[PDB]
């Protein structure tokens, strides 16, 4: 909380010397103030980001604080997956003028989410890393699909040069007691996504999440053991 930097309704904090998390938070009736994290990664002279928060105007209150603290350009995002909490703010990034990637899924599920489309669809191999043709110039970002779990176009993305994983809504952390919202979920599947992850990033220490602080790889286990009880 006291190295945490505000910025209006927002809440930034340094997990790496390239790497922030950004917190935003939604006011949802019967449990109140919710919140969502996400990644801004610098880049050389250009800033990337990881999912939106839940509005527009929180998403424009991301871009202006790394104008004001990084200033640096924001070259593209990525969004996890086609839910609020990480694709609310798309329509404040196009604004901007910025490039957004997306699963290909997600983009086609996003009009039935009521949410924006991004304007790049990202595809992936049989082993869930993604086509390096579909995400040019992505940095250190290593975005990978380890299939249907939370939703089934859930993706993740680890950040090369660092100890850091972004999990998103997929996994919860090690301390949890529910898998939040299956509500879109594959039980069936879910396990085995949250192990794959696992596998894809064996050398990840941090763990970042959407809707807790950044956790071991325990969060990864306890994810996996909780999946297992939905078969
Ligand atoms: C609602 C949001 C949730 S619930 C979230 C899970 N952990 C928080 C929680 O209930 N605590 C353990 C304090 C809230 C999840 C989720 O668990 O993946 N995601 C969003 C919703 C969703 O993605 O399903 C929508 C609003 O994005
Ligand atoms: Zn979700
Ligand atoms: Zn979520």
């Given at each position: 909380e006291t190295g945490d930097q505000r910025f209006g309704d927002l809440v930034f904090r340094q997990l790496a010397p390239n790497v922030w998390q950004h917190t935003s938070y939604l006011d949802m009736p019967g449990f109140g103030a919710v919140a969502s994290n996400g990644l801004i990664v610098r880049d050389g002279g250009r800033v990337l980001v990881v999912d939106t928060a839940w509005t527009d105007d929180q998403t424009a209150q991301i871009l202006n604080w790394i104008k004001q603290e990084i200033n640096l350009p924001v070259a593209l995002a990525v969004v996890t997956h086609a839910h609020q909490d990480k694709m609310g703010g798309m329509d404040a990034l196009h604004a901007?003028?910025?490039?957004?990637y997306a699963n290909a899924l997600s983009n086609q599920l996003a009009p039935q989410e009521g949410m924006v489309a991004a304007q790049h669809s990202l595809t992936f191999a049989?082993?869930?890393w993604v086509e390096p043709a579909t995400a040019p110039n992505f940095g250190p970002l290593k975005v990978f699909y380890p299939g249907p779990g939370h939703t089934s176009d859930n993706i993740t993305v680890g950040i090369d040069g660092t100890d850091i994983?972004?999990?998103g809504c997929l996994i919860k952390d090690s301390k949890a007691k529910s898998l939040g919202n299956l509500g879109?979920?594959?039980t069936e599947h879910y396990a085995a996504s949250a192990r794959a992850f696992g596998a894809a990033f064996?050398?990840?220490?941090?763990?970042?999440?959407?809707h807790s602080a950044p956790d071991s790889r325990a969060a990864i286990t306890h994810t996996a053991r909780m999946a297992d009880k939905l078969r």
């Amino acid at each position: 909380e006291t190295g945490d930097q505000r910025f209006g309704d927002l809440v930034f904090r340094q997990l790496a010397p390239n790497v922030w998390q950004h917190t935003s938070y939604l006011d949802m009736p019967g449990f109140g103030a919710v919140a969502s994290n996400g990644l801004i990664v610098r880049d050389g002279g250009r800033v990337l980001v990881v999912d939106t928060a839940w509005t527009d105007d929180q998403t424009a209150q991301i871009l202006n604080w790394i104008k004001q603290e990084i200033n640096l350009p924001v070259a593209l995002a990525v969004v996890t997956h086609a839910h609020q909490d990480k694709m609310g703010g798309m329509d404040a990034l196009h604004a901007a003028g910025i490039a957004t990637y997306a699963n290909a899924l997600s983009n086609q599920l996003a009009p039935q989410e009521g949410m924006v489309a991004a304007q790049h669809s990202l595809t992936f191999a049989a082993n869930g890393w993604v086509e390096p043709a579909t995400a040019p110039n992505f940095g250190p970002l290593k975005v990978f699909y380890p299939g249907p779990g939370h939703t089934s176009d859930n993706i993740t993305v680890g950040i090369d040069g660092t100890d850091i994983a972004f999990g998103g809504c997929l996994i919860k952390d090690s301390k949890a007691k529910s898998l939040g919202n299956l509500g879109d979920a594959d039980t069936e599947h879910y396990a085995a996504s949250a192990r794959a992850f696992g596998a894809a990033f064996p050398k990840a220490s941090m763990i970042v999440m959407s809707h807790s602080a950044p956790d071991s790889r325990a969060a990864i286990t306890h994810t996996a053991r909780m999946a297992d009880k939905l078969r």
